[PDB]
Design an enzyme around this catalytic site. Structure first.
Site, short mmCIF file in Angstrom:
data_model
loop_
_atom_site.label_atom_id
_atom_site.label_comp_id
_atom_site.label_asym_id
_atom_site.label_seq_id
_atom_site.Cartn_x
_atom_site.Cartn_y
_atom_site.Cartn_z
N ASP A 101 4.70 24.29 19.70
CA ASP A 101 3.98 24.93 18.62
C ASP A 101 2.89 24.01 18.08
OD1 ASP A 101 3.76 27.16 16.56
OD2 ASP A 101 4.20 25.46 15.24
N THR A 139 -1.40 29.30 15.87
CA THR A 139 -1.78 28.04 15.26
C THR A 139 -2.39 27.07 16.27
OG1 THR A 139 0.46 27.16 15.57
CG2 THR A 139 -0.03 28.28 13.49
N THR A 140 -2.08 27.22 17.56
CA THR A 140 -2.64 26.33 18.57
C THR A 140 -4.09 26.68 18.89
OG1 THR A 140 -0.45 25.97 19.53
CG2 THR A 140 -2.35 25.45 20.90
N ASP A 169 8.29 33.09 14.77
CA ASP A 169 6.98 33.46 15.32
C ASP A 169 7.03 34.81 16.02
OD1 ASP A 169 5.96 31.12 14.33
OD2 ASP A 169 6.00 30.04 16.24
#
Lengths: 536, 336, 546, 520
Positions: free
Chosen positions: D56, D89-90, D386
């Site tokens: 993550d 988020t990446t 997630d």
């Protein structure tokens, strides 16, 4: 700073910078510290001071040139006053304590003018113009003593001698010191009374006895004794003679050898036996050349081997060994002889002539010293000083040395002044009178130079326990009522403020340099603004 | 720059010498010379230090001339006494109140002060402050009646004389009921407003649950009875001492005063009562029984004006008009 | 500079005392060291700076108010501009960047004037006489707020304050938010005088979406968390009653320092049950009054939470004292510190409760806030900012805070002046002919004062990576011909300034750049007092701490 | 003097811009291997010793201490994506890191002012949102089979793709349970309870509606299995209450001390009689329970649980429907929990677990995850959050956008047509966003082992044919459209990723100086 190191010059933080009023205040106070030291030793009522050297040796003197020479200082302004008195002692040799007091007096009056907003160059410009007005005024007051004959000329030399002999230790014998200092110049001098050679008079100190044993001896005083002391100490001339026929030789007594490195190869016994006879024939030939020339005392620079001890003893020839090269020049001047480089050039005309050669026992052991006397007036006069202390024998040298510096200055024609503070008072009122006529911005410059000249007479009243205000007011009122400039301060309290009856006499060339050295030095000091002193 | 970090820029030579620590024993005596000049006359502290250093420079050369120090000291004392009579003939007397002589002398006395450019309106300010106290006996004119209050922010041009007493501290604002007060009577409270407690340790024991119901009502009834006597005298403004020992205000007390719209300012200095009592013309009330209408004064406008973040409480006018008034001036400036 | 001076020669001080020109030289370097920061941050082309506390946190601040506050300056004269930047926020609220650069330039050019031997009083008088004529000249060149039929002002006022900030490109969107926020929070006092309580608009920090999507809240938004989760999250219906109480709802000890002594053990329980019952008596009067939302300054004990859930009442605890005062006036409620009245009885009156259209609690990015909209008595407003992180919103918080102070000065005083170097350049030509009249030694002081104001328009072009001289030379051509423009509008030649984006000289009125007139008066007077105090310091004395 | 004590030396100009761009690129370079279904894993070491192994983006950034001041702003960007959405988020850091990498040869080369670039980035941000809106298509939000394929979007990257068939059934019923009608479903992660139980099998799991408590029973006689449980929540402890007034009792008579202890026993019995009025089968409190109150509840069959977490009581009130009341005098039959059932305590050697099953629309659920190890179990917990975050944006708006390289390239193609038509100073910074959107599809190829040169060359030619659905495969790297495989992601994830990168790029480009030493 912006965050980066700012360095203009290496050792930034080590060196410091002074500017503004604080830079001038530090320079004046540096001279006031030196002045108050010299003001105590100024005048015949002054006091000496102990000088401790880093090696342990001590020196007691009142001389401003000697005190400041061995004095270890820090501030460079006080170091400028060191060479000020050194400039006075090297050339004139008199008044080394007066140039320091007069220079600081000019700086004390200049500090008051700086606080009033006067530019320092305007202060220096006023002292230069006031210096020539004081010298030209004193030059017209003095008179020429050269009209007198040689009988009265000796009296003026005795007058200025007793003045310089004061203020220093062993001042009770100044009566005899003044007589011996003048007779040295009477013997050594030109026939025209001009340009006398000072180097012909040597100062040789001796530690022992008492001060009453000091007397004049014309000749050479050596620290070396007679070699092989089987001979009589006191040498006497023959019944009839032209002289003692003193011999001087810079060559030691040895068989001749090349200056270059040489190799003498003996390949047979016959060649070795010839060297035996050749060896003794040279020592026999060298001693015969002296006997045929009539010489008696032989002087050798490098000495000689023990072979000639008995050889010179058979012929009754005195000999000395290990004589310095500088002393050989002093020997040939006294006896009017000529140095003989080798026996082949040895002649009877090159031999010196003196009255008597003898040695003194001095104390118990000590060392053996040779003494030479002259039978008439010669060009060599050697000073002989004795004392019960090492400090007395030392200071007495420079005490009579400065006394001879005053006499040789009187050899110059038409320069004489009277001391005792009468010279500074006469030149002070002449400068203050011009200040009223000139006015302008320089009106305060002549006032500072007039008040500085009065410091020397006021300093003389401090050491004598008098009132400087009442003494200076009497001298100023005397010059206004009468034109006689001979009235001055009397530290001995004998009365008769006239210098004519007190015989005190000073050279004009000595007093003229005191104003020039003080005025020209303050002109450079007042120009100093940024002071950069690196750390030791 | 002091050792504690405080930085003071002062033209007056007294503060310059006082804030500066001198290591020399005699050089510190000049600090107290300006103290005597500031305590008596109050002006010339810079000149008296220069005159002292000038006499030492003139007497420095007199020591080497053979004059005894006591002769020098006796000569200056005889010359200073003669110098007094020199100024007595040249000076001219002035009328009791003159706008020409007083204003021109006040602006001249400023000289190098930063207010010299602001001296236009400041010169009548110092003159009118002294003219309020007039006497034929030439009293020292105590300056305790003249209060100069400092406020951070603003400009010096905004400095002006206030027609009434100014309060340094602000309002409590916890209740904040009244926004603005007009035609109010300013009170002075020297006691504490709180639930009843002795000044010494006490004990309250509750033996029944019905007793706590009477306690909460009677503690609020005491604060209510105080507001009743204040409402009868129509006192809309109250001033309370700090009272570090006993709580001066309470949440139950401020709520009772919010209903009557009574403005209260606390944390007042104890030594400022003489300026509050004589300026506002109000007799302090230290007891709820001694509180009456005669001890209360009168004020036209009592408000707190917030200007550019600077909050200040000012009072306009005093209807008492007692024997002598007081002076109140608020000082403003950009830099502290 | 150069080599350090000697330390206390005959002066006999324990600290360091330097005299002469070295003090004034270090005083200029103190103001020049702090200026080089504020310089590059001036103008729309300015760039933000990042300050670090060495603890791992960074601070991005464009204006020099917080920069000089965070940076520690131990120089005595350097603290003057530090306090001056903190001052500019108090009076005007904007101009902290321009006040530092001008005050630093007045001292910079005065460093060459003292070398002329000119006394500072002549230098100070030259700046003050030129300032008295400068303030009067600004009042002559001001423009009225009427302009065209519509407003066309307050929208352009905010766009000037949004310059130099990262949100400057979005100023078109934030222009309508700042104007509508101040007009809702306005009040009335002094019998007709309208006041603008700056900081009444809540600034909330949220994450996600974008700054362009930030919605203006038609009402006050309270930042806090819900007491209990069992309470209804959204309250609908008209006339929502709100209770603001400053009294503790938690159980507290009896009195303060007393002691409870019980003899009969049968009364041990009954006395303790009464302590918990008195607290719920004030809650019973609130439930019967119909209050939907109960706002409490301090915390709320679990005893009061069970009564709010059963009655469907939203409790709120840990409220700021300054936040509830704005809720009371907006919703119409009266702040209640305690329940009591003039009579001895204790009761709750329904008049203390406010009214609004709706009360809803919104949660975005861990930020929980109660949205109070539709206040009938007095309107309010709130702005929810959205950005990268909390530190990215720290600059946006002060960006909108300075915009509220600029619009406040335009509504109180309708006189405004164009920005972008219009006032600084116009004062130069006016003081050129004025200096020749006085002459003597004050002619050079006035001439340097007019040239010192040129640092503001020149800084705009330097930070824009363009040629400054060609922009300034063409700038003076309009101002030098403006004084000689002469009467007869056809005058023109005035209200022209530098456009840094297009690199041209255009009218600032049509460009939409305006600045309050009072901002120029307070800036020139505050920047001068900083320079006057420095020029008057002959000697700096630093005493070592003990 | 030293003047400023904080960073008296200053680094300004191009030197400060390079330090901000280089440090920002290093943040995205480490996570380049963290994107794609073949993405690797990263292990982190905290000073406490706990090991965190995950791919993550946010979990890697917040646990790394960066000494570079401007690079810390890159660490907080993932928090904006995680708190608002939680997915993608990446891709935020990879996109934001590529912008500054592409924007670097301007201030140094073209000498373009940052504000000029900022004006171009804002105009490119508006056009980017329109392209994402056009490529987005609405879908049915009530279709259970359609939402299962949408949750697999974020699962394909995570290690749980093997259990994805089982994981979709766990996340689907979890979001549907806590949501309710009102801003639409207004679902919140705080209502969803994820319990981590070490040991077991991942293939065996079930969604449990209720609260799983690890506390044991207070008395052995307490029945661990109830057919019709009744839950009554009490915040007041069953222990004897002591007044905070510090009441001191003075005992004189001999019967006074013995009566105090009796009254303490009478009130505890009295408080139990107030509870027995409604006759609850279960009792749950958040504080301690005295040993005296335990016997008085044995006759009524009241099972008591003590020291329950405060937030768990609010979750019990949702499932059981009970109302929290602190005082026992206000307890009524309406406040007693109803409709609850299947109350059983399963015996496990580690801890005692209590089960609850439900039959005012807000509900709650407790997901029991059984992993192979405690650290892997922490990964499934993060993967489950997630997975549920994807279904949130689907229920908020019907809009659904393509993913896997199709959305990123669809924007870059539209930016290339408008760039040539600008013909101005803003043309150069406007082309930086077009090349910045290429990093995400290029990263998917580098992690898959394919050739990005030939694939991206033919990929741009496909988007010119009028189809926006052409993506990049994560396994074979084929140019086949994403409609066949079914990759789809909510539009909110695509919008929050682009908006955050543009707002963050304008922040670091405006920093001309870096100073330290303030120490506030």
């Amino acid at each position: 700073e912006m965050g980066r190191p700012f360095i203009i010059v290496k050792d930034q933080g080590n060196k410091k910078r002074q500017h503004g009023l604080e830079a001038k205040k530090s320079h004046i106070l540096a001279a006031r510290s030196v002045a108050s030291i010299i003001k105590t030793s100024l005048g015949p009522r002054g006091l000496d001071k102990i000088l401790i050297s880093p090696d342990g040796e001590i020196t007691i003197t009142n001389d401003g040139a000697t005190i400041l020479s061995q004095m270890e200082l820090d501030n460079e302004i006080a170091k400028l006053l060191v060479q000020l008195s050194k400039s006075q002692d090297d050339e004139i040799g008199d008044g080394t304590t007066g140039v320091v007091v007069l220079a600081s007096a000019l700086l004390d009056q200049a500090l008051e003018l700086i606080q009033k907003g006067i530019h320092p160059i305007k202060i220096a410009n006023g002292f230069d113009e006031a210096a020539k007005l004081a010298i030209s005024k004193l030059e017209e007051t003095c008179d020429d003593i050269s009209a007198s004959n040689d009988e009265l000329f000796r009296d003026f030399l005795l007058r200025a001698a007793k003045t310089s002999l004061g203020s220093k230790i062993v001042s009770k014998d100044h009566d005899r010191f003044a007589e011996m200092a003048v007779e040295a110049v009477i013997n050594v001098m030109d026939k025209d009374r001009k340009d006398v050679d000072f180097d012909l008079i040597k100062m040789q100190g001796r530690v022992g006895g008492s001060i009453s044993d000091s007397k004049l001896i014309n000749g050479v005083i050596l620290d070396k004794d007679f070699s092989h002391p089987q001979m009589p100490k006191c040498v006497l001339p023959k019944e009839g003679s032209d002289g003692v026929k003193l011999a001087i030789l810079t060559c030691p007594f040895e068989p001749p050898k090349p200056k270059t490195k040489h190799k003498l190869d003996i390949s047979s016994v016959e060649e070795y036996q010839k060297l035996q006879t050749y060896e003794q024939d040279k020592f026999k030939e060298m001693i015969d050349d002296v006997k045929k020339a009539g010489a008696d005392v032989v002087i050798c620079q490098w000495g000689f081997d023990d072979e000639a001890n008995h050889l010179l003893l058979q012929n009754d020839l005195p000999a000395v060994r290990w004589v310095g090269g500088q002393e050989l020049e002093h020997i040939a001047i006294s006896t009017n002889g000529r140095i003989v480089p080798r026996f082949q050039d040895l002649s009877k005309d090159k031999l010196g002539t003196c009255s008597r050669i003898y040695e003194q026992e001095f104390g118990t052991t000590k060392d053996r010293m040779l003494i030479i006397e002259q039978s008439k007036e010669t060009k060599t006069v050697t000073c002989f000083v004795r004392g019960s202390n090492k400090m007395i024998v030392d200071e007495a040298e420079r005490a009579l040395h400065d006394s001879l510096c005053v006499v040789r200055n009187l050899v110059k024609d038409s320069r004489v002044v009277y001391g005792g503070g009468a010279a500074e008072v006469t030149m002070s009122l002449a400068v203050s009178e011009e200040a009223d006529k000139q006015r302008g911005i320089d009106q305060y410059a002549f006032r500072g130079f007039a008040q500085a000249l009065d410091t020397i007479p006021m300093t003389l009243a401090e050491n004598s326990g008098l009132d400087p205000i009442g003494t200076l007011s009497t001298l100023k009122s005397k010059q206004l009522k009468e034109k006689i400039s001979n009235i001055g301060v009397d530290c001995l309290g004998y009365g008769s403020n006239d210098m004519k009856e007190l015989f005190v006499v000073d050279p004009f060339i000595g007093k003229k340099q005191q104003i020039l050295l003080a005025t020209q030095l303050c002109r450079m000091i007042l120009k100093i603004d940024n002071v950069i002193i690196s750390g030791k | 720059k002091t050792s504690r970090g405080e930085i003071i820029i002062s033209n007056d030579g007294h503060t310059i010498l006082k804030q500066m620590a001198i290591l020399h024993p005699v050089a510190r005596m000049l600090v107290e010379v300006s103290a005597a000049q500031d305590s008596e006359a109050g002006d010339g502290t810079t000149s008296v230090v220069i005159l002292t250093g000038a006499l030492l420079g003139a007497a420095e050369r007199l020591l080497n001339k053979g004059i005894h120090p006591t002769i020098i000291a006796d000569s200056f004392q005889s010359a200073a006494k003669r110098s007094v009579d020199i100024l007595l003939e040249m000076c001219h007397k002035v009328s009791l109140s003159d706008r020409e002589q007083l204003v021109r002398a006040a602006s001249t006395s400023l000289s190098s002060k930063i207010v010299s450019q602001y001296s236009s309106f400041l010169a009548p300010l110092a003159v009118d402050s002294v003219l309020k106290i007039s006497d034929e006996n030439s009293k020292n004119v105590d300056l305790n009646d003249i209060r100069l209050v400092k406020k951070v922010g603003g400009t010096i041009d905004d400095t002006e004389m206030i027609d009434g007493v100014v309060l340094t501290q602000t309002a409590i604002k916890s209740a904040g009921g009244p926004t603005r007060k007009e035609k109010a009577k300013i009170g002075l409270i020297q006691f504490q407003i709180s639930p009843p407690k002795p000044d010494t340790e006490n004990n309250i024991i509750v033996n029944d649950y019905r007793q706590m119901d009477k306690i909460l009502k009677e503690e609020r009834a005491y604060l209510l009875n105080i507001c009743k006597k204040i409402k009868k005298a129509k006192c809309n403004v109250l001033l309370i001492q700090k009272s570090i020992l006993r709580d001066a205000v309470n949440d139950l007390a401020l709520h009772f005063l919010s209903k009557l719209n009574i403005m209260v300012v606390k944390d007042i200095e104890r030594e400022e009562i003489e300026f509050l009592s004589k300026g506002l013309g109000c007799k302090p009330i230290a007891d709820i029984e001694l509180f009456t209408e005669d001890r209360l004064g009168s004020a036209d406008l009592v408000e707190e004006i917030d200007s550019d973040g600077s909050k200040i409480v000012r009072v306009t006018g005093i209807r008492n008009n007692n024997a002598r008034p007081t002076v109140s001036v608020v000082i403003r400036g950009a830099n502290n | 500079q150069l080599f350090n001076n000697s330390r206390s020669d005959t002066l006999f001080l324990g600290g360091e005392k330097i005299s002469g020109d070295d003090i004034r030289n270090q005083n200029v370097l103190a103001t020049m060291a702090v200026a080089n920061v504020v310089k590059s941050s001036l103008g729309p082309v300015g760039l933000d700076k990042m300050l670090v506390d060495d603890i791992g946190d960074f601070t991005v601040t464009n204006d020099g108010a917080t920069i000089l506050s965070l940076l520690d300056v131990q120089h005595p004269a350097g603290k003057i501009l530090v306090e001056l930047a903190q001052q500019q926020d108090r009076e005007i609220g904007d101009g902290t960047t321009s006040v530092v650069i001008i005050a630093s330039e007045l001292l910079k050019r005065a460093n060459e004037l003292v070398k002329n031997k000119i006394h500072p009083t002549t230098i100070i008088t030259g700046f003050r006489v030129a300032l008295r004529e400068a303030i009067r000249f600004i009042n002559e060149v001001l423009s009225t707020s009427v302009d065209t039929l519509g407003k066309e002002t307050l929208i352009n006022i905010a766009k000037t304050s949004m310059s130099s900030k990262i949100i400057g490109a979005d100023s078109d969107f934030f222009s309508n938010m700042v104007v509508d926020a101040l007009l809702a929070v306005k009040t009335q006092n002094s019998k007709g005088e309208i006041k603008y309580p700056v900081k009444a608009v809540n600034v909330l920090k949220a994450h996600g979406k974008s700054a362009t999507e930030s919605l203006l809240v038609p009402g006050y938004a309270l930042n806090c968390t819900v007491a209990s989760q069992a309470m209804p999250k959204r309250i609908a219906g008209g006339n929502v009653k709100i209770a603001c109480l400053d009294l503790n709802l938690q159980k507290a000890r009896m009195a303060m320092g007393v002691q409870i002594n019980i003899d009969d053990p049968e009364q041990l329980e009954q006395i303790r049950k009464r302590e918990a019952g008195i607290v719920l008596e004030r809650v019973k009067k609130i439930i019967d009054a119909g209050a939907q939302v109960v706002l409490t300054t301090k915390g709320i004990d679990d005893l009061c939470l069970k009564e709010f859930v059963e009655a469907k009442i939203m409790g709120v605890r840990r409220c700021k004292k300054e936040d509830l005062r704005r809720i009371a006036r907006a919703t119409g409620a009266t702040l209640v510190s305690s329940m009591s009245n003039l009579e001895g009885e204790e009761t709750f009156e329904s008049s203390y409760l406010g009214l609004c259209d709706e009360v809803v609690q919104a949660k975005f990015s861990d930020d929980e806030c109660i949205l109070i909209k539709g206040t009938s008595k007095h309107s309010s407003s709130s702005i929810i900012l959205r950005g990268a992180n909390d530190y990215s919103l720290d600059e946006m918080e002060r960006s909108l805070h300075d915009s509220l102070s600029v619009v406040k000065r335009t509504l109180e005083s309708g006189n405004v002046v164009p920005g972008g170097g219009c006032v600084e350049a116009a004062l130069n030509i006016y003081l050129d002919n004025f200096a020749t009249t006085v002459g003597s030694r004050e002619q050079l002081a006035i001439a340097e004062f007019a040239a010192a104001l040129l640092i503001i328009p020149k800084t705009l072009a330097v930070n824009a990576a363009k040629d400054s001289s060609e922009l300034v030379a063409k700038l003076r051509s309009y101002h030098a011909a403006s004084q000689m423009a002469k009467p007869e509008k056809r005058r023109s030649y005035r209200n022209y300034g530098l456009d840094l984006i297009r690199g041209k000289i255009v009218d600032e009125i049509h460009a939409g750049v305006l600045e309050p007139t009072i901002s120029k008066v307070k800036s020139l007077k505050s920047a001068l007092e900083a320079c006057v105090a420095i020029l008057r310091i002959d000697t700096m004395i630093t005493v070592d701490p003990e | 003097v030293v003047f400023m004590n904080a960073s008296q030396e200053r680094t300004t100009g191009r030197q400060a811009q390079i330090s901000n761009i280089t440090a920002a690129k290093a943040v995205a370079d480490v996570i380049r291997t963290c994107l794609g279904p073949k993405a690797m894993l990263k292990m982190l070491l905290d000073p406490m010793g706990g090991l965190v192994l995950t791919n993550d983006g946010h979990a890697i950034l917040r646990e790394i201490d960066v000494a570079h001041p401007a690079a810390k702003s890159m660490l907080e960007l993932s928090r904006t994506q995680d708190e608002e959405v939680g997915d993608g988020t990446t891709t935020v850091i990879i996109l934001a890191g590529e912008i500054l990498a592409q924007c670097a040869p301007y201030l140094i080369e073209k000498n373009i002012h940052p504000v000029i670039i900022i004006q171009a980035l804002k105009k490119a941000l508006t056009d980017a949102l329109e392209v994402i809106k056009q490529v987005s298509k609405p879908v049915d939000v009530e279709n259970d089979a359609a939402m299962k394929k949408l949750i697999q979007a974020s699962i394909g990257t995570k290690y749980v793709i093997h259990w994805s068939e089982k994981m979709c059934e766990l996340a689907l019923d979890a979001v549907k349970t806590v949501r309710k009608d009102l801003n639409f479903e207004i679902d919140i992660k705080r209502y969803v309870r994820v319990e981590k139980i070490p040991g077991g099998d991942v293939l065996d799991s079930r969604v449990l509606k209720g609260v799983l408590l690890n506390k044991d029973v207070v008395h052995p006689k307490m029945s661990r299995h109830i057919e019709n449980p009744r839950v009554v929540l009490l915040d007041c402890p069953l222990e004897y209450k002591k007044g905070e007034s510090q009441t001191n009792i003075e005992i004189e008579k001999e019967e006074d001390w013995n009566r105090i202890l009796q009254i303490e026993e009478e009130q505890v019995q009295l408080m139990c009689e107030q509870i027995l009025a409604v006759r609850p089968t279960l009792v749950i409190t958040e504080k301690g329970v005295s040993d005296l109150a335990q016997h008085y509840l044995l006759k009524g069959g009241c099972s008591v649980l003590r020291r329950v977490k405060k937030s768990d009581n609010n979750r019990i009130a949702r499932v059981t429907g009970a109302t929290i009341v602190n005082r026992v005098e206000d307890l009524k039959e309406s406040d007693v929990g109803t409709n609850c059932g299947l109350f059983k305590v399963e015996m496990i050697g580690d801890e005692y677990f209590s089960f609850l099953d439900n039959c005012g629309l807000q509900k709650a659920c407790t997901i029991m995850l059984r992993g192979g190890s405690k650290d892997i179990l922490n990964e499934i917990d993060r993967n489950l959050q997630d997975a549920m975050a994807v279904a949130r944006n689907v229920m908020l708006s019907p809009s659904l956008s393509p993913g896997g390289g199709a959305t990123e390239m669809a924007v870059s193609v539209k930016l290339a047509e408008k760039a040539k038509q600008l013909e101005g100073i803003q043309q150069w910074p406007y082309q930086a966003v077009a090349d910045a959107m290429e990093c995400i599809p290029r990263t998917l190829i580098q992690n898959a082992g394919g050739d990005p040169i030939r694939l991206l060359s033919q990929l741009r030619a496909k988007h010119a044919q009028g189809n926006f659905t052409t993506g990049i495969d994560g396994d074979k790297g084929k140019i086949v459209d994403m409609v066949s495989y079914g990759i789809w992601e909510p539009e909110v994830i695509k919008q929050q990723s682009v908006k955050t990168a543009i707002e963050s790029a304008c922040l670091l480009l405006r920093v001309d100086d870096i100073v330290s030493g303030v120490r506030k």
